[PDB]
């Protein structure tokens, strides 16, 4: 018997560079037995969502706005930005076809080495 993952989205950290400044999410991710770490942005997620609305269209993925008129790093906003992005995924990985999907796979790390 194969392990259905699950995962969650429990923080998020701000990283800065030069003028630059990006909110890191950190994924939990667990399949049976054993749990990693991934980190992810709010775009890596919105490429996922992009690629997957298209090819199953009768799912109605949802994922929180891309675009916000005001601050980016209202620590509210993003709050609520990665209740939005949990809810994603974790409705993601219900759909074994889904977990099976070459891009999220490799979006949760699940066939690494890293992890064995």
Known sequence: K???PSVSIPSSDEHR???KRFTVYKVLVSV?????????RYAE???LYNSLKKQFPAMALKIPAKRIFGD???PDFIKQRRAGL???IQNLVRYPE???HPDVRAFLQMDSPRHQ
């Open 72 to 74: 980016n790093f209202d």
């Open 2 to 4: 194969e392990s259905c």
């Open 86 to 88: 949990n809810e994603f």
């Open 32 to 40: 049976g037995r054993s749990e990693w770490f991934v980190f992810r």
């Open 45 to 47: 997620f919105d490429k």
């Open 98 to 100: 889904l977990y099976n």
């Open 17 to 19: 560079e030069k003028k």
